[PDB]
Amino acid sequence: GCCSDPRCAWRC
Numbered sequence: 255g256c257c258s259d260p261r262c263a264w265r266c
Contacts, residue, residue, distance in 0.1 A: 257266035 256262040
């Protein structure tokens with residue numbers, strides 16, 4: 255998942 259990565263979760 256995207257929300258799995260911090261580089262994405264940053265905006266989750």
